[PDB]
Amino acid sequence: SRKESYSIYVYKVLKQVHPDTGISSKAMGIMNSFVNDIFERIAGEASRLAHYNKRSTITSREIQTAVRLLLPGELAKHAVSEGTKAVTKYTS
Amino acid sequence: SRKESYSIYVYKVLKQVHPDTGISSKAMGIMNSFVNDIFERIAGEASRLAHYNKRSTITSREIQTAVRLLLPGELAKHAVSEGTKAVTKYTSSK
Amino acid sequence: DNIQGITKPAIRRLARRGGVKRISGLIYEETRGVLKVFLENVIRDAVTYTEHAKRKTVTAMDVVYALKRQGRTLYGFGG
Amino acid sequence: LRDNIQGITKPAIRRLARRGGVKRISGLIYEETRGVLKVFLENVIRDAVTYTEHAKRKTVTAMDVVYALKRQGRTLYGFGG
Amino acid sequence: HRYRPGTVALREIRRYQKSTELLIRKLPFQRLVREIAQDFKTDLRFQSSAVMALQEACEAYLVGLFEDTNLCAIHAKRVTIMPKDIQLARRIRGERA
Amino acid sequence: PGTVALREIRRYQKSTELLIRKLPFQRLVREIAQDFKTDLRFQSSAVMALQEACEAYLVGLFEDTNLCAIHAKRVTIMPKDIQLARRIRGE
Amino acid sequence: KAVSRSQRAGLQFPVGRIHRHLKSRTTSHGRVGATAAVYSAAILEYLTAEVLELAGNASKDLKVKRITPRHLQLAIRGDEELDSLIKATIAGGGVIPHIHKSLIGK
Amino acid sequence: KTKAVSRSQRAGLQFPVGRIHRHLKSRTTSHGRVGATAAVYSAAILEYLTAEVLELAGNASKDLKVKRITPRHLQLAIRGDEELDSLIKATIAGGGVLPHIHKSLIGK
């Protein structure tokens, strides 16, 4: 049966930024772990945020707050400026 | 509007174990908070054993495992005994 | 400036509860540094939980949740 | 099993030390460091066996030890999860 | 009559280590949390009990930092605490470097 | 004099190999698990995932321990430094 | 005549207010009834260790009514516990006395 | 019936908007996972795999190799000032250590 991983999107993104470069298989497992750790931290914090405010859904703002808590510094104001591109394009 | 707290149950347990004694309104805030905190740790952590095994339903044998991850030393060995007694009484009456 | 109102004798009291006998005169202006950064790091989160819910007063629950997030929980004000 | 903590032989402790950036190691560091490593192993393999017992397995598996580490603030990237 | 240097420092330990009262003045700490807040969102308001939960958390942090600092000075043969002690304690607990 | 001990630092901070012998560490982890349950079997990747986490803890402790020896004006690390680094860390 | 599930377990704490609480922390799926009866009695049983160990404190000071300078001066003195509550300061609780052996006069 | 256009390409993203929705629902979440909140979440995941690969190949280049072996992660993830805060909890297996001799242990 199928096992499923993020392994292709990290490779796709590598060819976005370093078109000559590659990854060893052992160094893929790192990205395939890291990328789902940050998934869980955002899901867990966004879940608590909905609960504290006694909502049921989790709209964009329930995540933009979870990113603006969880990320340390310039990464917060960058990631917030990056995600507000994506939904602004999607809703056209 | 109205709020739910464990304020009555801690007093009811206090009178089980120190009959002459009582507890300040400043100290109730703490006990109610300790009870919430340990609840949220057990319930929040119990969800993860359901994910790791890909089971749907939270169950006694699952909670039993949460209160041997979250509790240290001999404290765990007592809680695990105490809760087993409680289930055995419940399931003998339904 | 308002940070200088964390007066020298107050630092001595805090220190005395912690059990220290004798305090170098450099510790006063250095300790203010660690208090000022600690308050900075929990007020960022408390105002974040405020701005999320659209209200514009920081509640006791906001500072409780901010402190809870950073591993510095308090039982007292609402667990 | 016999006495297998003695198999963390003195030179190996010196290698670990050398990585960590230390010059000179008093002779009492060897028997202290075995003490620290045995306490760490106990507190992680206990969790790893409780994750195993929940699933009715006998074989301890890599995800069990990774979940065991993850709850103590000591997350490991490299073996999944 | 006048005591020896040292006598009154140990008298103060046995006092402030027996009380549970707050050690920073109210208004001077209330001014500080407002000034640090208005740099992040202008025209806030605080609930009267929010600033108390700041103070009760701060004092309990400062007092813990000193308790872990004195451990360094004692190890380094001194009894006096000095900045170089705090920088060690705060580095091993991973806060600053 | 005093230089070859320093030449080892520049070696082991460049290599990323595991520094404890494999079989001796594997037999220790089998010993410590027996008092939790008899007759485990260990998956070959589980024993590795322990070792990778152990060495990374030990070497973090020697990094944090050295800082204490420097504080006492010494060079040599001593158990009283490990004890301090663990007490102040909260182990 | 309705019974209460607390009485069938033999517990003082609310077995059915739990259950309803757990059913709000649950992925998208349900929770067995026999969970509330060893969820509770492993929250009671910390009470009658948190309270209870105050025998060693409130009664020893000849004062009635538990107050916040206790629990502290206990929860951070008994040491099977402490590990459960490290993550928490106690408001208005102060600290246990010490003084290290090198600061006192020799 | 007018073909299909995947939610990723509509958003402008290389990460899978569909897969992530179906992961968020059936996470430890409450019972309503809005679809606009899987786009502002593929984005604030892909952005790290730029901001953390960008600088890593940026150092595989400097050692004159082609393929990013595992230590080249450690030498960024635990070298950039913001990444060192985001990944505190992480041990990179086979990742080595950032080299350093303490300035007081060198002689003269």
CATH code, domain carrying D68: 1.10.20.10
**Residue owning tokens 């410590």:** F32
Structure token pair of residue D80: 């999944």
Nearest-CA distance C71 → chain G (Å): 6
User: Considering just the CA atoms, what is the radius of gyration of chain C in Å?
Assistant: 16
Cα separations (Å) of E58 from C69, C73, E11?
A: 15, 12, 24
Nearest residue on chain A to H5, alpha-carbon basis:
A90
What is d(CA B78, CA B72) in angstroms, rounded to the nearest whole number? 11
User: In sequence order, which residues have a C-beta less than 8 Å from that of residue D20 and are 6 or more positions away?
Assistant: F58, F59, F60, F61, F62, F63, F65, F66
How far is Cα B89 from Cα B93, in angstroms, rounded to an integer?
Answer: 7
- List phi, psi (to 5°) of E45: -130, 145
Start-to-end CA distance of chain E, whole Å, equals 49
Q: Between chain F and chain C, are at least 3 CB pairs below 8 A?
A: no
Query: What CA–CA distances, in Å, run from E62 to C20, E23, E66, H74?
Result: 13, 11, 6, 34
Who's near B94: CB < 8 A, 6+ residues apart? G8
b or e along A63-75 (b: 16 or more beta carbons within 10 Å of the residue's beta carbon)? bbbbbbbbbeeeb
Which chain B residue has its CA at the smallest distance from H28's CA?
B47
Q: Kindly state the tokens that stand for G79.
A: 């040491």
Q: Do A56 and H27 touch (CB under 8 A)?
A: no
Q: Does D56 touch chain B (CB under 8 A)?
A: no
Q: Of F87, F73, F79, F8, which is closest to residue D26 (Cα–Cα)? A: F79
d(CA H44, CA F38): 46
Q: Which two tokens stand for residue H85?
A: 């805060």
Structure tokens at H33: 């996972």
Distances in Å between the Cα of H59 and the Cα atoms of H64, H68, H76, H88 are 9, 9, 8, 21
Buried/exposed code over B25-57 (b: 16+ C-beta within 10 A; e: otherwise): ebbbbbbbbbbbbbbebbbebbbbbbeeeeeee
DSSP letters spanning D7-74: GS-HHHHHHHHHHHT-SEE-TTHHHHHHHHHHHHHHHHHHHHHHHHHHTT-SEE-HHHHHHHHHTTT-
CA H36: distance to chain centroid?
Answer: 22
Burial class (CB in 10 A: 0-12, 13-18, 19+), G33: middle
With CA atoms as reference, report the closest residue to G72 among A52, H81, C75, H75.
C75
Question: Is the distance from CB of B36 to CB of G18 less than 8 angstroms?
Answer: no
Coil vs helix vs strand at C74: strand
The label of the residue with tokens 């549970």 reads: E20
3-state secondary structure of C22: strand
Contact assessment for residue D61 and residue D49, using Cβ atoms and an 8 Å cutoff: no
H52-66 residues labelled b (16+ CB within 10 A) or e (exposed): bbebbbeebeeeeee
DSSP D75: -
Whether chain G has a CB inside 8 Å of the CB on C25: the answer is: no
Can you count the helices (H) and strands (E) in chain E? 4, 2
**Residue H64, token pair as written in the block:** 């004159």
| Alpha-carbon gap, residue A19 to A17, rounded angstroms | 6
Chain F residue closest in CA terms to H72: F16
Show the CA angle centred on residue G13, arms to residues G18 and C66, nearest 5°: 60
* Helix pair H36-51, A25-52: axis angle to 10 deg: 140
How many angstroms separate the CA atoms of C72 and C70, rounded? Answer: 6
| CA separation for the pair C26, C35 (Å, rounded) | 15
Overall domain count for chain D = 1
Interatomic CA distance for residues B28 and E6, integer angstroms:
41
> For chain A, give me the number of helices (H) and strands (E)?
4, 1
Residue B59: closest CA among B44, B47, B41:
B47
Neighbouring residues of H85: CB distance < 8 A, sequence distance ≥ 6: A72, A73
Cα separation of H10 and H15, whole Å? 12
- Whole-number Å distance between alpha carbons of G59 and G56: 7
Q: Which residues of A touch C47 (CB under 8 A)?
A: none
Could you give the count of Cα atoms lying within 13 Å of E57 in the half-sphere of its Cβ?
29
Is the Cβ–Cβ distance between F79 and F62 less than 8 Å?
Answer: no
Cβ pair C75, G88 in contact under 8 A: yes
Residue D60, φ and ψ in degrees, nearest 5: -75, 135
Rounded to whole angstroms, what are the CA distances from D75 to E69, F49, F52, H89?
29, 11, 11, 6
The terminus-to-terminus CA distance of chain C in angstroms comes to 35
User: Are B14 and G51 spatial neighbours (Cβ–Cβ below 8 Å)?
Assistant: yes
Q: Given a contact as 3+ CB pairs under 8 Å, which chains touch A?
A: C, D, H
Distance CA E2, CA B92 (A): 76
The Cβ of residue F1 has, within 10 Å, a number of other Cβ atoms equal to 5
Radius of gyration of chain D (CA): 16
Q: What span, in angstroms and rounded, lies between the C-alpha atoms of C10 and B85?
A: 53
Please choose, from the candidates C11, D10, D54, the residue with its C-alpha nearest in 3D space to the C-alpha of residue E86: C11
Domains of chain F by start residue, with CATH? 9-91 (1.10.20.10)
Q: How many CB atoms lie within 10 A of CB C28?
A: 18
Task: Check: CB of residue A58 under 8 Å from CB of residue H37.
Answer: yes
Which residues on H lie below 8 Å from A12 (Cβ)? 14
Contacts of E62 (CB under 8 A, 6+ apart): C14, C18, C31, C34, C35
Residue from E46, G21, H83, E62 nearest C57 by CA: E46
| SS3 category, G72 | coil
Token code pair at residue B69: 């991850």
CA H96 to chain centre: 19
CB H44 to CB A34 under 8 A? no
Burial state string for F41-65 with b = 16 or more CB within 10 A and e = fewer than 16: ebbebbbbbbbbbbbbbbbbbbbbb
Domain around C69: 1-77
Question: How many residues are recorded in chain G?
Answer: 106
Distance between CA atoms of residues A12 and A23, nearest Å: 11
C-alpha triplet F45, F47, F50: angle, nearest 5°: 110
C partners (3+ CB pairs within 8 A) are A, B, E, G
Q: Identify the sign of the CA torsion E55, E60, E65, E71.
A: positive
Q: H93, F52 in Cβ contact below 8 A?
A: yes
What would the DSSP string read from start to end of E50-71? HHHHHHHHHHHHHHHHHHHHHH
The 3 state secondary structure assigned to chain H is CCCCCCHHHHHCCCCCHHHHHHHHCCCCCCCCCCCHHHHHHHHHHHHHHHHCCHHHHHHHCCCCCCEECCHHHHHHHCCCCCHHHHCCCCEECCCCCCCCCCCCCCCC
Contact criterion met (CB below 8 Å) for A48 and H47: no
Helix residue spans in G1-106 (DSSP H):
5-9, 17-20, 33-39
Q: Which amino acid is at H52?
A: E
As beta bridge partners, residue G43 has G45
Best of B45, B47, B64, B68 to mutate (most D CBs within 10 Å, chain D): B68
| 8 Å CB contact between F39 and D58 | yes
Which amino acid type is present at position B4? E
Using CA coordinates, name the residue in chain H closest to A80.
H44
What does each C-alpha distance from F8 to D24, F20, G12 come to in angstroms? 12, 16, 64
Report the Cα–Cα distance between both ends of chain G, in Å, rounded: 74
Rounded to whole angstroms, the Cα distance separating D80 from E20 reads 48
- Give the closest residue to D68 by CA, choosing from A34, G9, F33: F33
Q: How were these coordinates obtained?
A: cryo-EM
User: Is B24:B16 a contact under the CB 8 Å cutoff?
Assistant: no
Contact E20, G94 (CB under 8 A): yes
Give the list of residues 6+ apart from residue D23 with CB closer than 8 angstroms, or none. F2, F5, F6, F9, F75, F76, H105
- CA-based torsion, G19, G51, G46, C66: positive or negative: positive
Helix, strand, coil percentages, rounded to 5, for chain E: 60, 5, 35
Q: What whole-number distance in Å separates Cα of residue C60 and Cα of residue E33? A: 14
Q: How far is CA H76 from CA A6, E92, F11, in A?
A: 21, 22, 21
Which of B10, B31, B32, B33 to mutate to probe the C interface, most C CBs <10 Å?
B33
Q: What single string gives the DSSP state of each residue in B15-52?
A: HHH-TT--B-HHHHHHHHHHHHHHHHHHHHHHHHHHHH
A68 part of contact set with chain C, CB < 8 Å: yes
Q: Is-contact F79 D32, C-beta < 8 A? A: yes
Which amino acid, one-letter code, is at B50?
A
In which residue are the tokens 């407002």 written? E34
- H54 to chain D, minimum CA–CA distance in Å? 20
- Closest CB from A13, A55, A59 relative to H36: A59
Tell me which chain H residue has its CA closest to the CA of residue F6: H106
- Chains in contact with D via at least 3 Cβ–Cβ pairs below 8 Å: A, B, F, H
Contact G66 B24 (CB under 8 A): yes
DSSP 8-state secondary structure symbol assigned to residue C47: H
Query: For B75-93, b where at least 16 C-beta lie within 10 A, e where not — what string?
Result: bbebbbebbbebbebbeee
Residues 6+ apart with CB under 8 A from B82: G41, G42, G45
3-state DSSP assignment of residue G103: coil
CB pairs A-H closer than 8 Å: 176
Side-chain half-sphere exposure of H80, counting CA atoms within 13 A = 22
Q: Which helix (H) or strand (E) holds F87?
A: helix F79-89
Q: Any contact of E with A, at least 3 CB pairs below 8 A?
A: no
D75 with H91: Cβ contact below 8 A: yes
Closest CA to A23 of H22, A34, E74: A34
E37: Cβ–Cβ under 8 A, 6 or more apart, which residues?
C43, C47, C58, E44, E46
Q: Nearest Cβ partner of H91 from D21, D23, D76? A: D76
Output DSSP code: residue G66. B
Closest to D22 (Cα-Cα) out of F1, H106, F76: F76
- Return d(Cα A49, Cα H29) in angstroms, integer: 10
The amino acid at residue B92 is: S
D-contacting residues of F 20-59, CB under 8 Å?
20-21, 24-25, 27-34, 36-37, 39-43, 45-46, 48-50, 52-59
